[PDB]
Amino acid sequence: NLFGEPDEGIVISRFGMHADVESADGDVHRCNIRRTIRSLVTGDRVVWRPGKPAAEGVNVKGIVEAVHERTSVLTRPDFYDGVKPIAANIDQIVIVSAILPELSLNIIDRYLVACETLQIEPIIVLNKIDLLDDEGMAFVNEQMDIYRNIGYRVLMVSSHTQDGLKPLEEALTGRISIFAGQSGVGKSSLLNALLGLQKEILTNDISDNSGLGQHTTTAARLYHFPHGGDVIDSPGVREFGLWHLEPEQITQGFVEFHDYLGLCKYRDCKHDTDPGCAIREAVEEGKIAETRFENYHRILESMAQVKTRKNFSD
Amino acid sequence: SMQDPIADMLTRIRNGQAANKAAVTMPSSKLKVAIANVLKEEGFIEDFKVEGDTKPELELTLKYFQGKAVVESIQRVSRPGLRIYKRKDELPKVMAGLGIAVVSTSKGVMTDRAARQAGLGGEIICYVA
Amino acid sequence: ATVNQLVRKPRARKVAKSNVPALEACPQKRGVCTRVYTTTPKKPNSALRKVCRVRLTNGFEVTSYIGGEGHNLQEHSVILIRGGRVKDLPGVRYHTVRGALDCSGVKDRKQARSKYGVKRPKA
RNA sequence: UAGCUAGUAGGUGGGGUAACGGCUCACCUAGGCGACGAUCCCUAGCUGGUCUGAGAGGAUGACCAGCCACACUGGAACUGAGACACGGUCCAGACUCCUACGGGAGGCAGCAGUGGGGAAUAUUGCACAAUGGGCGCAAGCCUGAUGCAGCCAUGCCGCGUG
RNA sequence: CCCGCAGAAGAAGCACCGGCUAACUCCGUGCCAGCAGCCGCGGUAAUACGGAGGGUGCAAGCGUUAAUCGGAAUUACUGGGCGUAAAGCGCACGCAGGCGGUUUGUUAAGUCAGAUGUGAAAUCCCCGGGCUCAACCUGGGAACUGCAUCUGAUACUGGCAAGCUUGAGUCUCGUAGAGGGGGGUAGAAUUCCAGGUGUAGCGGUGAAAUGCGUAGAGAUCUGGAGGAAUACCGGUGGCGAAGGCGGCCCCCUGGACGAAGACUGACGCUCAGGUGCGAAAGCGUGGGGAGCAAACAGGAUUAGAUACCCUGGUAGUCCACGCCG
RNA sequence: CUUACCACUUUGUGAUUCAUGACUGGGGUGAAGUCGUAACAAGGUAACCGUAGGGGAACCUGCGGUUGGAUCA
Ligand SMILES: Nc1nc2c(ncn2[C@@H]2O[C@H](COP(=O)(O)OP(=O)(O)NP(=O)(O)O)[C@@H](O)[C@H]2O)c(=O)[nH]1
Ligand SMILES: [Mg+2]
Ligand SMILES: [Mg+2]
Ligand SMILES: [Mg+2]
Ligand SMILES: [Mg+2]
Ligand SMILES: [Mg+2]
Ligand SMILES: [Mg+2]
Ligand SMILES: [Mg+2]
Ligand SMILES: [Mg+2]
Ligand SMILES: [Mg+2]
Ligand SMILES: [Mg+2]
Ligand SMILES: [Mg+2]
Ligand SMILES: [Mg+2]
Ligand SMILES: [Mg+2]
Ligand SMILES: [Mg+2]
Ligand SMILES: [Mg+2]
Ligand SMILES: [Mg+2]
Ligand SMILES: [Mg+2]
Ligand SMILES: [Mg+2]
Ligand SMILES: [Mg+2]
Ligand SMILES: [Mg+2]
Ligand SMILES: [Mg+2]
Ligand SMILES: [Mg+2]
Ligand SMILES: [Mg+2]
Ligand SMILES: [Mg+2]
Ligand SMILES: [Mg+2]
Ligand SMILES: [Mg+2]
Ligand SMILES: [Mg+2]
Ligand SMILES: [Mg+2]
Ligand SMILES: [Mg+2]
Ligand SMILES: [Mg+2]
Ligand SMILES: [Mg+2]
Ligand SMILES: [Mg+2]
Ligand SMILES: [Mg+2]
Ligand SMILES: [Mg+2]
Ligand SMILES: [Mg+2]
Ligand SMILES: [Mg+2]
Ligand SMILES: [Mg+2]
Ligand SMILES: [Mg+2]
Ligand SMILES: [Mg+2]
Ligand SMILES: [Mg+2]
Ligand SMILES: [Mg+2]
Ligand SMILES: [Mg+2]
Ligand SMILES: [Mg+2]
Ligand SMILES: [Mg+2]
Ligand SMILES: [Mg+2]
Ligand SMILES: [Mg+2]
Ligand SMILES: [Zn+2]
């Protein structure tokens, strides 16, 4: 046979031709994949079987036969490729942003819209607050509160000084949390700080140069949380554009808009300059975050630019 | 520079036959005269004549039995870059003896037929068909 | 081109590169399996090829294919390899002689038995 | 791999060899070889031939025949018509063997055969009946040359299994 | 080797069957297991995987691997190529070398002819002979395509001698040319400085912003300073070996072409090594620096702009001498 | 007993070669991963050549060159 009896297992990480699979016993192994399988990402739950463990005193590659149906999944549309998933069976995403690499009220909004379409509970963290001066901290908090004023969990943590992680640790316990965000924001460093993994094994960490940082982590790897649950390190991303999502799904994604649906005199209210747009005046009096409204409009107009492709995303 | 007059004469004949000329003219030579005599004897060329004394010129009258060139193939075999000498027994045969190979033997310039009938080997000047 | 050029330097023919250098023109060689592992083929083909990396007697180390369904090969196995080429296995240019002094024949093989070291069934 | 060479290349004289010769020596000359590849480096016994090819060529040198070189490694000579000698001598070295530790013995790349290496290659056979060879007047003796036998489907050819 | 006895009695396997390539169907399987010399097969009827039946080929052998030649004209002597498929050095000069116009004489080196000697036997081939045939052994012949020597032949190539002028070169007279090196000079234009007038914007983009302007910008006039390049002519134009060369003038200098005539008399072509020239960028030292502009600074766009765009701007761009090649 | 030649050997060294090798540089192949999409149409700022600078990456910019670039009375 040259292989052991089949068993259930999780996908700790995917590396092209072959992935890393953890058995229920908790031992991880490199395992190949059958060509019949089409999609297989981190967090997937698969039926696999290891090879007979006698070769050069080390383990031989296992084979993964099939994957179980995903419960949840985090996907992202890719030009030339369609929508592709990053990690499945996820319970919570943590949008990791940092002031130095880039400050983007636009990427955070795109992520919020996405996770709202995916029903996954989000949480905003802002890394490297050590770089900002105390005045600058008071200058970043009065717009980080934009989201905590609509309930979003907003935390500020310094990975280098391990400052204020402790609430992040608490929010991370006993759940499955994918660390997502732009490259250089500190997702790997934050994981090193939180996991407290052995010094011999650490995620790659290169410093940013000029306008933007490198793409160090090119993989998505699961990690077992010390207290309880699991986190997932993800590769940095540049554009989280949303052309696959329908335009209405973007209005739904902004949670501060349900307070004004059906209050626009024109029923098909595009809400930009159409008369009687409730959210227009709502943002006129400051009920809505101006930046959020402008971001909504600009991502809508961005969808027009990226609708040029005739490929399908269904 | 001109480093082989015999190949020049051959190609003059060839291009004259192709361009359907009536008569060609080379700067004459004793050797050129002898080769022309062979092709007149073999009915390859109708006639040849030498004019002038200080700068003599040889003139050849090309044949055309059906308007098509009588000499349909002609090529220099022993060139200055590589000389070719054959012994009497291994003398060549052009078109299996239908054509004529001109060879310079110790007894002058003669057709392969005359040469091997005289039992003499020599430098193969060229093949005329 | 010119005969003079050929004289100044003659035409050098093209010597052939042997596609089985580890054989040293020997029809077969003997080695010991240092590692048995499963590999993947080229894009047209999908499979778990059973191959073994073998340290040869003449100091050479090469990867060899194992024909037939199943093998009893493990680490420290004295096998005999033969020349050949596997198209879909890049870098595998040797087979294993099924039935050669460590590797047994294929079980219940009935046709082309000689190609797998399977003695004639008693009948 | 572009320079190499000082007994180097010549000459005279002496010596030496069976024989010519820097073969050797004294002196003299300053040459000699090299791009038509010297020197250096790697590889390699050569040929008749063998395989292939229409031929030119290509590959190659297993068997048989001719030549060469070698006989554990290095060196030297003796004896002799012929040797610097496979089963002769001396020395030195390595290894193996005997030892009374004082010293001694040996050389299968002859025929069998053993271990080892290898994918792989055979009997520790019979006879000098024949052909050769050595010695002998001869008879005859010797001959793992040779003639035969043994083993192997290794090849070619033939036959059967109706 | 011959005779006798018994009894079909003691004696058949291996590979292949998708095409190449002779030979096809069922079942199992289901991109798995597996096959495969090359193309290739396998995801639900697989003639390609495994088993079975049937068939094809060979046979005491059959297959696989290794190795050589062939096919392969795929090292092209026989018998290949180089505009775009691999392949003309960036260009030139030039030693060795290869090749060499035409006539006469001589020589006989090459070349050819004849003769002789030799090219061991075996092996290869042909006609025979002997093993019951064959393999095998064997007689005779042919062949061994080679080498050497001697005697001749003199057409061609080579050598020698004497020529000849058609190749090559010289001279006389002129033509055209951004050919080259050096030195002057001119006129526009950009920028800068100083001053005159004078107001509030200028500048830039698709739109803007950065930037400059009330100390007066921008605009306009006058004067000055400096650097770089030479509208129009201008061309499908010319010159140069190539790279390249563009205001005008002077000095030095190379080549090309034309007419006629004289002169020399093969003095020629090509060229491995070698030597030289050789766009731009770049390097060293020292000047110079108007404009332009890698790097860099800034403003926009953008997820970002690390680019395109905008405002600036260093090296460099220019000169001298070297280097790079 | 001496002298000459001289094999072996010992140093001081030089050259060269083999085996191994700490520690590394790039490469190749697979490829159903990741980040963007560099080129192919004027590939959406024409590509490419030489050179210099810059940058996670394909690449960007300057200088000169080519058409093996579309459109353009
Ligand atoms: N000053 C500062 N630097 C930090 C802090 N946290 C992390 N960094 C540094 O910022 C860089 C972030 O790299 P990394 O963690 O790999 O980035 P990422 O956001 O995980 N994404 P990617 O892997 O694509 O680069 C590293 O150099 C890391 O050490 C912090 O709190 N302060
Ligand atoms: Mg993609
Ligand atoms: Mg990371
Ligand atoms: Mg498109
Ligand atoms: Mg003497
Ligand atoms: Mg004497
Ligand atoms: Mg040898
Ligand atoms: Mg042939
Ligand atoms: Mg040889
Ligand atoms: Mg032998
Ligand atoms: Mg020995
Ligand atoms: Mg004696
Ligand atoms: Mg001897
Ligand atoms: Mg002896
Ligand atoms: Mg012996
Ligand atoms: Mg022996
Ligand atoms: Mg006798
Ligand atoms: Mg005896
Ligand atoms: Mg037999
Ligand atoms: Mg068929
Ligand atoms: Mg099918
Ligand atoms: Mg079926
Ligand atoms: Mg089958
Ligand atoms: Mg069958
Ligand atoms: Mg050939
Ligand atoms: Mg060709
Ligand atoms: Mg090309
Ligand atoms: Mg080409
Ligand atoms: Mg050229
Ligand atoms: Mg001549
Ligand atoms: Mg000459
Ligand atoms: Mg002769
Ligand atoms: Mg003979
Ligand atoms: Mg007979
Ligand atoms: Mg002459
Ligand atoms: Mg004269
Ligand atoms: Mg040269
Ligand atoms: Mg320059
Ligand atoms: Mg400079
Ligand atoms: Mg300077
Ligand atoms: Mg600029
Ligand atoms: Mg910006
Ligand atoms: Mg100057
Ligand atoms: Mg593109
Ligand atoms: Mg482009
Ligand atoms: Mg740049
Ligand atoms: Mg040019
Ligand atoms: Zn509205």
Domain assignments of chain B as residue spans, ordered by start:
1-71, 72-129
Q: Nearest-CA neighbor of A22 among A11, A33, A32, A13?
A: A11
Domain positions in chain C: 1-123
- A145 and A250 co-located in one domain: no
- Point out which residues pair with C42 in neighbouring strands: none
- A167 and A21 co-located in one domain: no
Other beta carbons within 10 angstroms of residue A81's beta carbon come to 10
- A248 and A187 co-located in one domain: no
Measured CA to CA, the distance from residue A111 to residue A179 in angstroms comes to: 12
Helix intervals (H) in A118-215 = 134-148, 165-172, 187-195
- A207 and A221 co-located in one domain: yes
Q: Nearest-CA neighbor of A120 among A175, A166, A194?
A: A175
- A43 and A175 co-located in one domain: no
Measured CA to CA, the distance from residue C99 to residue C96 in angstroms comes to: 9
CB contact under 8 A, C38 and A35: no
Which residue has its alpha carbon closest to ligand 1 atom 30?
A128
- A81 and A57 co-located in one domain: no
User: Is C1-123 in CATH node 2.40.50.140?
Assistant: yes
Cβ-proximal residues to A2 (8 Å cutoff; 6+ apart), any chain: A51, A52, A60, C38, C50, C70, C71
- In the three-class reduction of DSSP (H, G, I as helix; E, B as strand; rest coil), residue A300 is classed as helix
Q: What is the H or E stretch that residue B110 is in?
A: strand B108-111
Other beta carbons within 10 angstroms of residue C3's beta carbon come to 10
How many folded domains does chain A comprise?
3
Measured CA to CA, the distance from residue A221 to residue A233 in angstroms comes to: 5
- Point out which residues pair with A134 in neighbouring strands: none
Cα dihedral B98, B104, B110, B113 sign = negative
Residue of chain B nearest C5, judged by CA positions: B81
Measured CA to CA, the distance from residue A58 to residue B94 in angstroms comes to: 78
**Cβ within 8 Å of C, B 26-85:** 81-82
- Point out which residues pair with A114 in neighbouring strands: none
Measured CA to CA, the distance from residue C23 to residue C89 in angstroms comes to: 19
Q: Nearest-CA neighbor of A92 among A175, A173, A10, A12?
A: A175
For chain A, the straight-line distance linking the first and the last C-alpha, in angstroms and rounded, comes to 40
Measured CA to CA, the distance from residue A284 to residue A279 in angstroms comes to: 8
Measured CA to CA, the distance from residue C21 to residue C58 in angstroms comes to: 11
Q: Which of A242, A261, A295 is the last residue of a domain?
A: A242
Q: Nearest-CA neighbor of B101 among B33, B24, B48, B42?
A: B42
- A128 and A238 co-located in one domain: yes
Q: According to the entry, how was the structure determined? A: cryo-EM
Other beta carbons within 10 angstroms of residue A149's beta carbon come to 11
Residue of chain A nearest C34, judged by CA positions: A56
Measured CA to CA, the distance from residue A11 to residue C68 in angstroms comes to: 32
Q: Which of A195, A211, A242 is the last residue of a domain?
A: A242
Matching residue, tokens 């390190």:
A233
- A104 and A37 co-located in one domain: no
Q: Nearest-CA neighbor of A140 among A105, A96, A184?
A: A105
Measured CA to CA, the distance from residue A125 to residue A148 in angstroms comes to: 11
Q: What is the DSSP letter of A148?
A: H
Measured CA to CA, the distance from residue C53 to residue C63 in angstroms comes to: 4
Measured CA to CA, the distance from residue A269 to residue A263 in angstroms comes to: 10
- Point out which residues pair with A107 in neighbouring strands: none
Q: Which of A69, A96, A111 is the last residue of a domain?
A: A69
For ligand 1, mutation pick of A99, A103, A156, A205 (most atoms within 8 Å of CB): A205
**Any ligand 1 atom below 6 A from CB of A101:** no
Matching residue, tokens 């003659």:
C10
Cβ-proximal residues to C54 (8 Å cutoff; 6+ apart), any chain: C31, C32, C33, C34, C61, C62, C63, C64, C79, C81, C94
**Reported structure resolution in angstroms:** 3.0
Report residue C120 CA to chain centroid gap: 25
Matching residue, tokens 């600009």:
A298
Structural domain for A14, as ranges: 1-69
